[PDB]
Structure formats: structure tokens, C-alpha cells
């Protein structure tokens, strides 16, 4: 519950996040419209 | 061809990758059908 949070790789963890962040943005809207858009 | 490598946030890196991972296997497979699936 309680750890350390010291910094590491900041141009990873920045790049890395705003991918992940894409990913879950996606999906959250896929299940929410609970449609897929055509061309 | 020749560069550093040093240790960055292993936890971090590893679950992020992942994420990421996946991210790109998604859109790599509705892309590579290019073809919406009927009823």
C-alpha cells in the first residue's frame, strides 16, 4: 500500500503513457457507442 | 550501431510495454482485415 516512487526513464514513461492513455480512450469509446463507424 | 543501455524502471517498463503491446495487435488486426464483419 505504501512504496518508494523515485524517477526512472522520463522520455519512456512519457511516450509509454500516452500510448497506453490511447489504448484505454479507445476501447473506453468502442463500449460506450456500442458501434463501430464505418468508412 | 553503438549506444548505451542502462537500467530504467523495470516494473514500469514491462506492464507499460505491455499495454502498448497490445494497442499496436489491435489496430494491426481490424487494419490488416480492412473489412467490417455483418451480422
Known amino acids: 500500500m505504501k512504496k518508494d516512487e523515485t524517477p526512472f526513464g522520463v522520455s ?3 511516450g509509454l503513457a500516452v500510448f497506453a ?3 484505454l480512450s479507445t476501447l473506453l469509446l468502442v463500449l460506450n ?3 463501430r463507424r464505418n468508412k
Do not use: E
Open 12 to 14: 519512456v514513461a512519457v
Open 21 to 23: 492513455c490511447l489504448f
Open 33 to 35: 457507442k456500442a458501434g
